[PDB]
Amino acid sequence: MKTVITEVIASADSQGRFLNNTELQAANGRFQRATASMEAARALTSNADSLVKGAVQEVYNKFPYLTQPGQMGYGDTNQAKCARDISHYLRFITYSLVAGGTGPLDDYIVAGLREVNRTFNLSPSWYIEALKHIKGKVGSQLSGQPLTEANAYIDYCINALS
Amino acid sequence: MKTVITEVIASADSQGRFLNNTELQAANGRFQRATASMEAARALTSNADSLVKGAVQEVYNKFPYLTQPGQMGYGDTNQAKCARDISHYLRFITYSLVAGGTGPLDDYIVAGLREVNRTFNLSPSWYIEALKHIKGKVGSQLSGQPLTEANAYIDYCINALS
Amino acid sequence: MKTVITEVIASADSQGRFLNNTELQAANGRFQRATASMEAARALTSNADSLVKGAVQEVYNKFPYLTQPGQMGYGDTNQAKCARDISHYLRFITYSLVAGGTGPLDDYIVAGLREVNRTFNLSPSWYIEALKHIKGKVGSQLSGQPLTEANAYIDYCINALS
Amino acid sequence: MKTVITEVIASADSQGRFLNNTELQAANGRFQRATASMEAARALTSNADSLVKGAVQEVYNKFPYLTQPGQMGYGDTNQAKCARDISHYLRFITYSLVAGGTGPLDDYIVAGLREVNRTFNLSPSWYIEALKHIKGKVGSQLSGQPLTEANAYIDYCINALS
Amino acid sequence: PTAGLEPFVRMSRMIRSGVPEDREEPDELW
Amino acid sequence: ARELTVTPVSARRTTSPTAPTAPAMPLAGYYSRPAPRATADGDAQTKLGITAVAPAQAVELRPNFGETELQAVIRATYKQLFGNTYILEADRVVQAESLLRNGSINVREFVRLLAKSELYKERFFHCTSNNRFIELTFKHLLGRAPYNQSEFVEHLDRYQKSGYDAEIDSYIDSDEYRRVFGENTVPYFRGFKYQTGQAAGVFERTLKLYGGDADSDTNRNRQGQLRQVDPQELLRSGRGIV
Amino acid sequence: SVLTKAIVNADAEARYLSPGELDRIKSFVASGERRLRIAQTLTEARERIVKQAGDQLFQIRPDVVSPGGNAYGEKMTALCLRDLDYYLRLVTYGIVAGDVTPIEEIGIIGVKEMYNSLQTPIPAVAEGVRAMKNVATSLLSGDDAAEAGFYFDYLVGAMQ
Amino acid sequence: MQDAFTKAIVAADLRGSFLSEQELNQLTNLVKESNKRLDAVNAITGNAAEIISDAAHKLFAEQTDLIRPGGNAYPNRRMAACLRDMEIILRYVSYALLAGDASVLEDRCLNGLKETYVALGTPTRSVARAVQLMKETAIGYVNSPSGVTRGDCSALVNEAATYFDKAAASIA
Amino acid sequence: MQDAFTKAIVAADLRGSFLSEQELNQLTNLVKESNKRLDAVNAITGNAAEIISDAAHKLFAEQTDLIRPGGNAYPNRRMAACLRDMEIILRYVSYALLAGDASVLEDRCLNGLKETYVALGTPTRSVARAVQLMKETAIGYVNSPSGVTRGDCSALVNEAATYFDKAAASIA
Amino acid sequence: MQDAFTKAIVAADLRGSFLSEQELNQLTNLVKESNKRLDAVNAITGNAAEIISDAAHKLFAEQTDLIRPGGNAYPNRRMAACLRDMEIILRYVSYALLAGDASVLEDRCLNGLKETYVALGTPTRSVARAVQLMKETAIGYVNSPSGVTRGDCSALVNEAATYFDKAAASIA
Ligand SMILES: CCC1=C(C)/C(=C/C2=NC(=C\c3[nH]c(/C=C4\NC(=O)[C@H](C)[C@H]4CC)c(C)c3CCC(=O)O)/C(CCC(=O)O)=C2C)NC1=O
Ligand SMILES: CCC1=C(C)/C(=C/C2=NC(=C\c3[nH]c(/C=C4\NC(=O)[C@H](C)[C@H]4CC)c(C)c3CCC(=O)O)/C(CCC(=O)O)=C2C)NC1=O
Ligand SMILES: CCC1=C(C)/C(=C/C2=NC(=C\c3[nH]c(/C=C4\NC(=O)[C@H](C)[C@H]4CC)c(C)c3CCC(=O)O)/C(CCC(=O)O)=C2C)NC1=O
Ligand SMILES: CCC1=C(C)/C(=C/C2=NC(=C\c3[nH]c(/C=C4\NC(=O)[C@H](C)[C@H]4CC)c(C)c3CCC(=O)O)/C(CCC(=O)O)=C2C)NC1=O
Ligand SMILES: CCC1=C(C)/C(=C/C2=NC(=C\c3[nH]c(/C=C4\NC(=O)[C@H](C)[C@H]4CC)c(C)c3CCC(=O)O)/C(CCC(=O)O)=C2C)NC1=O
Ligand SMILES: CCC1=C(C)/C(=C/C2=NC(=C\c3[nH]c(/C=C4\NC(=O)[C@H](C)[C@H]4CC)c(C)c3CCC(=O)O)/C(CCC(=O)O)=C2C)NC1=O
Ligand SMILES: CCC1=C(C)/C(=C/C2=NC(=C\c3[nH]c(/C=C4\NC(=O)[C@H](C)[C@H]4CC)c(C)c3CCC(=O)O)/C(CCC(=O)O)=C2C)NC1=O
Ligand SMILES: CCC1=C(C)/C(=C/C2=NC(=C\c3[nH]c(/C=C4\NC(=O)[C@H](C)[C@H]4CC)c(C)c3CCC(=O)O)/C(CCC(=O)O)=C2C)NC1=O
Ligand SMILES: CCC1=C(C)/C(=C/C2=NC(=C\c3[nH]c(/C=C4\NC(=O)[C@H](C)[C@H]4CC)c(C)c3CCC(=O)O)/C(CCC(=O)O)=C2C)NC1=O
Ligand SMILES: CCC1=C(C)/C(=C/C2=NC(=C\c3[nH]c(/C=C4\NC(=O)[C@H](C)[C@H]4CC)c(C)c3CCC(=O)O)/C(CCC(=O)O)=C2C)NC1=O
């Protein structure tokens, strides 16, 4: 699972080599950065409930037709599975924040994304728009390096979906 | 040439991938660490002259017999090439300090070391003892994270020679 | 370019082998089948104009919102590039009919499809719906083995897009 | 284990081939040569005791300082392990003589030599000087093709250590 | 244009207006 | 002004000094001064049209691989076997990637499945001459140019007798592939290191086959698939009535 | 050069070049590439050559580098090798010209008067040149070494 | 591979010298501006897809011949190759920007590239233009991002431009 | 591969939950002690050769049978293999120590190792002992280094020990 | 690969003939001198390391520029490459000497070598010189060895020289 720590260890191992000053300098970055990351994580964690309901709705407001009958934003089960899915994304964003890398996002959401979305007729556009909205609101929950971190990972998901 | 920057870039490139938060966190470590590194570098740079003469002599004081006739610490040319060689090591230590990794040491002294030393009848023990001495004196030129950095690289050379 | 003829030749060549009765039997299939294929081709060729306008419109009738301002079924250029694109598909369908295999479709539309559609924000759903409509109307232009052929290739495109 | 016999067999096997006149001619060399080899072997075998004590001492006479306290030619255990080690070399020399190739030397002393000597702070120079001395004395125990054989293998060890 | 005046790079039997471009200076090395 | 004039080196031309009644000091070193031809290490690799990148460093499935390391291996195998050519996600051998994900095949067998795929036949076999195909198969699977005109005749004769799949297996089951990639290393360019039992002309030929990190063994270049190592130059190094 | 020498004799007697003069220009120019190779090799090893000349010199005459010696001291020795570098350069010029015109105007006409003023012992400069012959000559094929050697022996001759 | 420090080191070594106080402070300044540099690299990474997409839309808006039959961005296979190359170049430009040195860009991407395209029949002038458009948009993003501290990034915007301009020059 | 954070994340995910305030602060503490951790990993790296050498000298001091003919650290080839394994294990222990999790050690080094040695005839009890000696000396170095700020590293010394003890247990 | 017999055979075959009584006795003589040949090859093998070392010491004694920064035998990596090439060439010269034919030397070592060095920036004249020094010392050893029967080895010393001289000529 990709973190700064696992990456430097992987690179050492693959050259049959003890960790050296290059690799320990790298690790210090990840540790120095934890405070901002983890502040973003705590804010995204406690606002999760509303961030999810905000983004879910915004998918319907931007794609009005989704909420008409015969469509995929209609009925309890679609709308339920949607909230859940955005919640999955926010969850892995917090994990990536806490972990010090994109690993959790890469392993649990990015690997396989398109195949799944394509089989199930899920448009990335919705998910990008969910995330664009989450990005708008996270502008006033955080600032400074915690916001930059939150942004880094939200944007990472949007690029994964384009 | 191995630095934190080149390492993360290498790892991105080899997966066909833009630099992400994992890789930029790593880079921040290298940049945050530059101050201590570069203080060590400046101190080792201006004391070079005496650090070299100190270590050269210590090789003869620890291996007295080297300075007798018919031996490899005798005559102007051996003793000249010795000072030069320790000077090469200190030079690459400062480079490794400034560069943010072992690259300069790996590329210019470690790659090929044993083959060369073995063909030319140069014992690593001398060089370890030169470096052990340099390590003793650098104890009072630096302290805190600049000393730790200086130590990291001196020790790296000693392990390369064992 | 994949045809029955190229496939059997490829398989012979790769075993360093003259064409034998297995491979010539195969070729006879492709030649025996040409009549139905080429009837489908002629019918799809002369109706092209209307098949394209029919499918283009159906994309807007099934996705009404596309034709509102700020959307991708609005303005002369989007609607022009759409007709063109369906026309490309029908063109390669006729080519695949005439060629005796999916080659023209594989090489000119399938290879790269998703990457392109994803960069340009083109939903496969439109294209599937264009093709589903074309399939409805081709029900009364052809029958028997020419219809089966037309169907084979239309369906092949729909699976490429799912 | 490398001998003329194993080498020709290896070369036949690897081409899936019976031994032919090329390979049997080779074998005749090894068999014709056995007499000189085995005379060298018998002389080195019975003089082993003194050849070893002669070379051990010569290591101290050429590196006087080794026998001072705090050094690696001091105390019963170092001096014991030294005699043993030269004895190992002479033993494998006799084996290589008897075997018709360098195999015993390659497998039991050469493979791994430098890594071991480097971890244990054993200078090859000692061992070369032990062998140079053994070579001096073997000048008057043998002559003709037995001496050439003894020399071949002693020199082989000296090159392995340079 | 200034082409007529250009072949004046030959100067005289031996007259070059000053300093012969890059000039090696080996004294440091010696 | 004394100090400025005197007390200061000033600007004449450049340079100074060392002369009568005399001299100046900045120290010196006998084997200190850098020799003039003058420079670098790595200029050498990088000078040409850099092949900075190959000195190599193989990637692999260090028992207990992560999904990120596996995806790096998959991307490296596609870059090596198809060069810098874009591969659409629909054109990828999803079955062979799934077998490698499941650990049911090694990196050698994944390379075998990719080299036997119809995509490799369309790009390299159907678009080039049999001699240019052999040059590219040596480039992609072994990371080198061919050593002598005998290797070409043996590979051409095997291809004629046993077909395409047996010719691909002959490179992968070679003791050269096994000795230097093993089972878990992705193929990589080798012709920049003198290797044991090599032929000095392999370096020059592997340079001719490696047009750099932006080149395409791409089968479209108008002329299309040709040849790049000369038959006359190939013949230097050996020529036999094999 | 060979050209300059031939022509000057031609013009001074108010005449076209002789068959002889034409022949030597032809033989000379045929040796062009070879002469250029001889100069290249020696240019390529210049720093090594002066040094080995300089060692050979100070063994044979340790006095020049002694209390009352012209080259006594580190910078009186530095200038001495620089002069040895000068003459090797002129020797490369002479070899490519095929005669001494250039060597002569640059470094022998006036050399007695120059060195007498500086009080440099001329015959030990001649020795420094022999020393350079010995080194340079060991980096050239037999045939090229002889061709080079004529120009070294000329300079040795002119300092006399 | 070089970065801006490694470059300093190589030049110092060719003199046989410890780094000059000149070179030391040039590198101290690079460390001084490194937070800005990280934001600049982050600006590109965070908008890579749009930078390529927007460059693309505009390239074919201008050069409608590329998307006709006969054109080098037709059919889907070729368009995907062209989109892929846009990404590859934007990638190596971002690497150079983290490094403070163009070498990774020149050595791994630009070296041989022009001759590849000519062999392929790919119109290099169109590729150069696609690179110019990526530059416009990329720098746009470097200059106007999400809640970054306000300051002057023009030095870095220039340097990024020269990497885009290197690539363009090398290819056209 | 896991590190201490990644481990937290996997357990959280198996609940379907954002990390517990419990788990958050456990990880905040790991960041709190991370400078000490870096010194501890650095202690091992900086003395790797001596740690292996000293362990080795002592292993064969105790078990003089291994260096007799018939013994598993005889002749040079086998001694080099044994010295190499000592390094490999010390290496994965240092990786675990940077990571705050044993998994890299268990997955890349310890998994199957015992059965390898038994197949080879390598005496596992001797290998276990060589690991115990590396532990003694390694921790020695973690506790008494060059001009590190004075404080308490016992938590980290314990954790390092458990990695040495895992390896020993797994092998014997 | 050819040896002196194989060479005879190839020339005979090109005539369509059984070997000439001329060629037969030339080869009978090679068998006659073969013990001396074995001693000559053995002289080189038995002193390979010193031959390379001594050549080396002397090469850098003469050409102190190679071991300065900027020089082609600096830093350690390049010196090891240069020492390695000295060994490779000495090795193929010894093979030619066992064979009685230069072909293995020309085909496996010398073919392309000059152009390699020029591509690399390796000064070929220095490499030629290193080969000349190996020759001096190698022949030294061929002529003055340990208790070999006294006789005349000048024919073999010449032939060895031509192999050294081939290599030098080919490279310079
Ligand atoms: C661990 C990370 C992870 C992700 C991200 C994930 C996505 C995901 N979304 C799914 C379905 C779904 N996703 C949605 C999404 C939406 N519906 C709406 O109202 C909106 C338009 C939209 C939210 C923006 C819908 C409606 C389904 C049901 C699709 C179906 O089965 O027909 C499914 C199919 C299995 C299922 O039916 O649950 C997966 C795997 N699964 C995962 O395991
Ligand atoms: C770029 C990095 C670099 C290193 C480190 C280096 C080491 C190095 N040391 C050498 C020689 C030498 N090294 C020494 C060393 C010593 N003599 C003494 O008085 C002491 C015992 C000892 C110093 C501790 C001696 C005496 C020689 C001459 C060996 C010979 O040619 O016989 C040589 C052989 C070339 C030469 O003669 O200069 C190399 C390459 N070269 C490099 O390019
Ligand atoms: C050879 C086979 C081939 C295919 C299939 C193809 C598809 C294709 N469609 C494109 C654009 C497009 N495709 C459409 C499609 C539509 N717009 C609508 O009104 C409808 C919703 C829909 C038709 C169903 C639109 C609007 C664009 C313009 C996208 C843009 O540049 O923003 C482009 C981008 C280049 C361009 O702008 O022309 C490609 C490559 N290109 C090819 O070479
Ligand atoms: C099968 C072939 C074979 C060889 C050649 C061999 C060499 C060898 N020598 C060793 C130690 C040793 N070797 C010596 C050698 C010497 N001490 C002196 O007085 C002299 C200077 C010198 C003899 C010339 C010494 C002192 C040690 C003890 C090193 C230590 O443990 O500190 C060891 C370490 C294990 C041990 O302590 O026994 C090995 C493996 N082992 C083998 O299995
Ligand atoms: C080292 C990093 C790297 C680069 C930069 C690279 C370039 C590159 N571009 C290629 C093809 C291509 N490149 C393009 C690009 C374009 N077409 C246009 O009309 C536009 C002007 C332009 C997009 C802006 C196209 C269309 C092809 C396919 C040409 C063909 O097969 O006909 C190929 C041939 C192999 C292949 O198709 O995959 C290479 C090697 N390869 C690499 O590995
Ligand atoms: C793509 C399909 C393909 C072709 C066409 C091909 C030709 C080809 N013919 C070759 C040799 C050869 N070709 C011949 C052919 C002839 N000799 C004569 O005198 C006649 C005029 C002629 C027969 C009619 C001979 C004798 C050789 C061996 C040359 C040698 O090694 O000396 C070789 C060198 C490799 C080898 O010997 O196997 C190739 C590549 N290789 C291929 O892969
Ligand atoms: C995860 C990797 C990582 C990043 C990305 C990072 C960014 C970062 N950018 C910073 C400052 C800044 N960043 C910028 C950047 C800009 N100013 C503008 O007006 C432009 C739009 C933009 C140009 C690129 C400026 C002006 C500052 C304040 C001055 C400075 O600290 O240098 C700071 C100092 C704290 C602060 O003032 O906010 C950090 C830590 N640190 C990291 O560890
Ligand atoms: C290059 C990678 C890297 C390293 C290695 C690093 C070390 C490092 N160790 C530190 C502190 C320290 N390190 C130790 C370590 C110890 N105390 C002891 O008495 C034991 C002998 C030893 C146990 C491991 C202690 C006690 C402190 C002070 C308390 C603290 O900051 O946590 C600090 C804080 C500044 C200071 O107080 O000196 C740094 C930056 N930072 C880095 O970026
Ligand atoms: C077929 C047998 C064979 C030969 C002969 C061979 C030569 C050879 N020498 C090389 C490099 C080299 N060779 C030297 C040699 C020298 N440097 C000097 O200054 C001296 C004049 C000279 C030593 C006498 C050096 C320094 C390099 C490294 C050049 C570099 O990377 O900058 C390389 C490039 C690959 C590498 O560095 O490993 C080859 C292929 N390779 C082979 O496989
Ligand atoms: C293991 C492989 C092998 C070797 C090495 C070998 C050597 C060998 N060298 C021999 C002779 C000899 N070897 C030499 C060699 C020399 N004479 C000199 O003065 C030179 C210094 C030196 C030049 C190379 C001479 C002169 C003879 C005696 C004449 C002869 O037998 O041809 C003989 C004949 C018996 C004898 O007279 O001693 C043998 C068997 N036989 C073998 O099976």
Outline the structure in words.
Chains H, I, J: The modification N4-methylasparagine is found at residue 72. Chains H, I, J: It comes from Gloeobacter violaceus (strain ATCC 29082 / PCC 7421). This is part of a larger assembly, with 4 copies of chain A (162 residues), 2 copies of chain E, 1 copy of chain G (160 residues) and 3 copies of chain H (172 residues). Chain E is low in regular secondary structure. Helices cover 77% and strands 0% of the residues of chain G. The longest helix of chain G has 24 residues, at 74-97. Chain H is 75% helix and 0% strand. Chain H has helices spanning 4-15, 21-32, 34-45, 48-62, 76-99, 103-110, 113-120, 124-143, 154-171. The two termini of chain H are 25 Å apart. The chains are: A mainly alpha (162), E little secondary structure (30), G mainly alpha (160), H mainly alpha (172). The interface between A and I is medium-sized, with 35 and 33 residues. Bound molecules: phycocyanobilin (10 copies). One phycocyanobilin (CYC) sits between chains I (35-36, 38-40, 42, 142-143, 145, 148-151, 153, 156) and A (21, 24-25, 28). The site of one phycocyanobilin (CYC) has 18 residues of chain A, from helix 4, helix 5 and helix 7.
CATH topology value of chain A: Globin-like
Using the 3D structure, state the CATH architecture of chain H. Answer: Orthogonal Bundle
What structural category do the secondary elements of chain H indicate? mainly alpha
Q: Output the CATH class name of chain A.
A: Mainly Alpha
Binding site for (2R,3E)-phycocyanobilin (chain G): 80, 82-83
Modified residues (N4-methylasparagine) (chain G): 70
Binding site for (2R,3E)-phycocyanobilin 1 (chain G): 70, 80
Membrane topology (chain G): Peripheral membrane protein
Could you give a quick summary of the protein structure above?
Chain E: This is Glr1262 protein. Chain E: Belongs to the phycobilisome linker protein family. The structure is cut from a larger assembly and holds four copies of chain A (162 residues), two copies of chain E, one copy of chain G (160 residues) and three copies of chain H (172 residues). Chain A is 75% helix and 0% strand.
Break the fold down into its secondary structure elements and pairings.
The structure is cut from a larger assembly and holds four copies of chain A (162 residues), two copies of chain E, one copy of chain G (160 residues) and three copies of chain H (172 residues).
Chain A: H1 4-13, H2 21-46, H3 48-62, H4 75-99, H5 103-110, H6 113-119, H7 124-137, H8 145-160
Helix pairs in contact in A: 1-2, 2-4, 2-8, 3-4, 3-7, 4-5, 4-8, 7-8
Chain E: no helix or strand
Chain H: H1 4-15, H2 21-32, H3 34-45, H4 48-62, H5 76-99, H6 103-110, H7 113-120, H8 124-143, H9 154-171
The structure holds phycocyanobilin (10 copies).
One phycocyanobilin sits between chains J (66, 72-73, 78, 81-82, 85-86, 88, 108-109, 113, 116, 120, 122-123, 126-127, 130) and F (41, 44, 193-194, 198, 200, 203).
